[model samples]
Target chain A: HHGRIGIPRERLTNETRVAATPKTVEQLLKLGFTVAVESGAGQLASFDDKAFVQAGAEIVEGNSVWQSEIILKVNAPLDDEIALLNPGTTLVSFIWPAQNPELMQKLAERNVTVMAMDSVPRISRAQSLDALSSMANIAGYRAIVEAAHEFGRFFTGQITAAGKVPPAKVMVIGAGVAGLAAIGAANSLGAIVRAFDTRPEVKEQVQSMGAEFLELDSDAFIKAEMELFAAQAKEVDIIVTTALIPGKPAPKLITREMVDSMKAGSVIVDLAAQNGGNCEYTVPGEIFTTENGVKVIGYTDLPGRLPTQSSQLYGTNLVNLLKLLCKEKDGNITVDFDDVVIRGVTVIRAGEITWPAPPIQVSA
Target chain B: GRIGIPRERLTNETRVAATPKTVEQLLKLGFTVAVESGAGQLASFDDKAFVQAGAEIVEGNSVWQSEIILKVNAPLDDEIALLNPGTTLVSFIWPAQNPELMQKLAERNVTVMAMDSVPRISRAQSLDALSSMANIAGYRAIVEAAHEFGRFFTGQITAAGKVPPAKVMVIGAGVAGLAAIGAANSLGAIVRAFDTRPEVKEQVQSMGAEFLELGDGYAKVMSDAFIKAEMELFAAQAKEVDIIVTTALIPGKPAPKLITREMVDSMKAGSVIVDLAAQNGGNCEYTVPGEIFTTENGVKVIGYTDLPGRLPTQSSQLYGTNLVNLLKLLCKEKDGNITVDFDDVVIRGVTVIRAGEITWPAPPIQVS
Candidate 1:
């Protein structure tokens, strides 16, 4: 009944967040799990090898850290990394199960129990284990900061001896965790923030954060929505798109017409870039200026920009879910099939598709 | 009636004391402006902009031969050598620290009007270049600090948990300190500020900050009568703050050392320190002027000078306004002749050397 937790170094170039911080390693150790972290796993997040060692975790070098019974990851493991996993091992990460048919098939063939953290139910009970919300919150705040950097003008209106500088106008698309965070950050900086989402239920939440909420009923006409956005885009200095679908590509809300109407020197921070951006011209992981001097920033890893806090929040979320999976006294791996959170998150159990059980399309 | 505006000769200098905005204002005052070609290029004000705004673009060192010379930095040896005898040179000349430059100006009988020496009086407020640049530095310091900081400044209640607001501590309550405090407060950070001047405590509290009192003798803490307990108190407070903005500078001298290396190391990982007085030799011990470096403990120390230069367009516009306001007081309306009225307090206060005679000597030159 020995369970060892492995924290692998995320292989993505832009990924700075590790699966666990040294503080989380200490928490895992107290729960009777032996945590082994890959060497320099937390270096980008500013957590050195000395800190991991002090937290009672073995600092294993190379890919050997992937050999543990249980593995924690920030991103879905690449095929090469997936091959390194031992058979029947419990793998926890942000596995977009519907988007990764090949990876899911490989994991099932290896007889692995996969817990997709991204698939954690949005219900109140499973909120602590929500990796999507945690990372989205960071991505939301970072999007504004990056936009401000690209923006040559001031966010807050300033009247000095020189002259008056009008405050920047910001529009956030989507009313999810990231959208709300972006609105809050923009509002805090004295920008005139506006947000829109198909779900009208979030309008009150958006207004509470001091941002004007634009109504766009998706059931109505797409043409009318595009017209509304084109009009709104003209006045905005920054447009941050955070709309995302769990299993599908992000919906394109900002059309080419909308971008064309925007003011010169305007900026667009596309947070849904990894999921095929909400803006028409967004090039994932690149920043380019349009002919009209509008900067379209399609950086996919917004949370990775602030890796330290992102890692802390992610580590806490993983720890909460790990606590639910492991037994208290004997440290034996236990699975409660009746638990709704476990039911939804466990995509594959012992080489079988558990959640979204047969006949559902797995790939886009 | 000729007023000269030369391109700043300093490396990486992006600021010009006079821009087209101020040049037009000077033109209205019946003064002909002779600007050096590409004087406002770095500040984003092109020569065409200056020319269209009623200024003649003169190439080479001929612009320095004008009756009044406008600049952002203290003139270099070559520039000082270019000044014609009895020419009025206006810029932020640190007269006390730069005795050699002052002696050179005096030997050449150049009338030196140091902008940094502008007295902090109600009437002279418009002419205060030091306060204007300091204000710019203060605002920029917070922006740069927030960019480098790993966490949010404001607290947010999310599904994961409640994130506490970043606690910011500002040292000094001068113009720059107040600006930093105001900027940090606006960003929704929990701000705590300390200063030697007890008179600034109300100002700190007005900006939504807790005024931290070191002692009754705090203002003169850097003097020979300095308190050792104050240093210990500062170290203790630095540990608790997520961000520290140091703006303490002794005019014409090296900026006072406030945050020691040990104090920086004691801070939590991912804390940020923005040294606004980086050009004046920095207020933090480890601060490399004009460089942003992170310590082994993940504490970032940003000591970028010329923060105003970073926002050149805005800084130049504001600084140009200051120069115009000050020049209006110094020049007469008819023929734009320069007037040296010793009886005028503002004139006497800013005039470091009037035509070879040292009107305001160092050490006792009024700081305000």
Candidate 2:
């Protein structure tokens, strides 16, 4: 059994996270799977080549990393990278299969077996392998910090001897992992937090986090949400928008007029900036200031901005996936389709596409 | 009589000593205001806003030549030359740091009441511009740290991974250190603060931060050993903490260098250090005052001096209110006349120059 677990250096600019930290490599080695990490792969995440070497990882240079039996990385491969893949090599990483149909097809032709960490179903069983939820949690908390930094006021109100300062109002759009995290961070910082979401069930959860949950009638939610947000934009000092549909670009919810209506020094953090942003005027990856002094923070690298934590979470997700696939401590892995998690995450299995895995009912 | 507010001449001096709210308060005291044209533009306070608040827009040196001149920074030689002999001047004048400036103010016969000279007495906190600005700098120190740190402050177990919260170590338990502890703690970071004084322990703990008892016990937690052990803890902390905010400052001396080069080199690549004492030569060995720079090992040292100016609007309002409260003591009668009453301890401490003589350094106030 060839036991080489290849950890590639991410070539994407500002893609700070690696698929494995030196700690993950140590765990893999304990399970008899030796790792060959590319030189400087984990540098951005504060893990240097010396650290990897101390953890018993082989420090390889260049394309030698592609020669291993398995490839682990944070991002999906580009065409140039895909061309370097060896036949029968099992790749584990975030592959948004639905969004990257052409990439999926290309991987199948290369005779590659892939585990798409992004395609894992949001269920109790595959929780450990879900990278989206992990990254989203960090991105959510980060959005609050980013917004707070740009806004020219304290989050907490002060009743000092000089004067009374009113608490900053923060509005969060969406109630998913990211939005909830944003809500919690903002609320904890003593800001008056308000959250809006279409899901009726998240109201109780949102309110429990000390955030005021706003609900719109489901039938009239579309235009109702728009008009409600337009008015809310005028009142709030900070807004964190996290609207996404998995396979589509984020829908524009904040209009230019809504941005213009905000007070001077008001900030908007678009969590969906990676999908071209939710704000109409968000310049992706830029702290763009409007003519009226509104700061539109469309930083797509929220998780990457906190590289060490994000990388560890992402690295552990890869480690968990490999642990499930290679049940035996030996380097050989069983590509078992019978396992529900294995089937869901496998976007390509040995020259065949296996995406959109059949949804299995949890109840008997 | 008209109290005049001029535009601060320094580049990036965004904060103004007076806001429209304070302008209105000043007017209620029976003094009309002459705000220099576009005095508060960077702070989002426009000339029209000042006008609407009933302040006349005086065009030039005449504003500085008014009955009273208000400023956020110490007046430069160019500005001091325009001061009328009996004109009262209010601004941050670090008398100890700038002895020459004190001489210049007295030579001009300017009745100068320095904001920094306001004693840190129980009754004078409202007029304590140092504490007000320090508090803002501390908060901004945390913000700058969070912006540079590539991770969240809180830790939780997700199926993706088990994570730990970031560790924040604050050196100095003064107003700035306390504010940093509060800001960092609220964000879910594990905050620990060290102080040379013991009284601040309660204040530190109440803000949800671990108070390092560096000066509690004479042998270890107390002074000489306390200073040695402080370096030992800070050295160890450099390797552990994800963020370090150093705010240690001695009144007239240069900011003590606590963070060694070896300590900074040992920190994590994504770690950040905010030196709130940057204006006084910084607390870190490698700090470049007024700039944020990265080290060879990827550690970021933030030495931004004008943190209050960074949050121009809020800092301006807070400082303006401090000035208004100061006027409440100086001008009890709504007659636009400010009296320097030496019997009143707060006013005596605040007045650095009276008539043609330098009245500082003022004697300590014995508050019972």
Best by lDDT: 2
Least accurate 10 contiguous residues by lDDT in model 1 chain B: B359-368
lDDT of 1 by residue, A290-364 (tens): 766688999988888888879988998988888888758344567787887787888999889786732322211
- Name the lDDT of candidate 1: 0.83
The C-alpha stretches of model 2 lying farther than 4 A from their native spots are A98-101, A217-220, A358-364, B48-52, B57-62, B213-226, B366-368
Looking at model 1, the pairs that clash are B119-B368, B120-B368
- Candidate 1's displacement at residue B117, Å, is 1.9
For candidate 2, what is the total of clashing residue pairs?
A: 4
lDDT of 2 at A38: 94
lDDT of each prediction vs. the true structure? Answer: 0.83, 0.87
What's each prediction's clash count? 2, 4
Which candidate has the highest TM-score of all?
A: 2
Model 1 lDDT per residue over B24-61, tens place: 88987878999999788766566777888999999999
Candidate 2: clashing pairs of residues: A305-B150, A306-B150, A306-B151, B217-B222
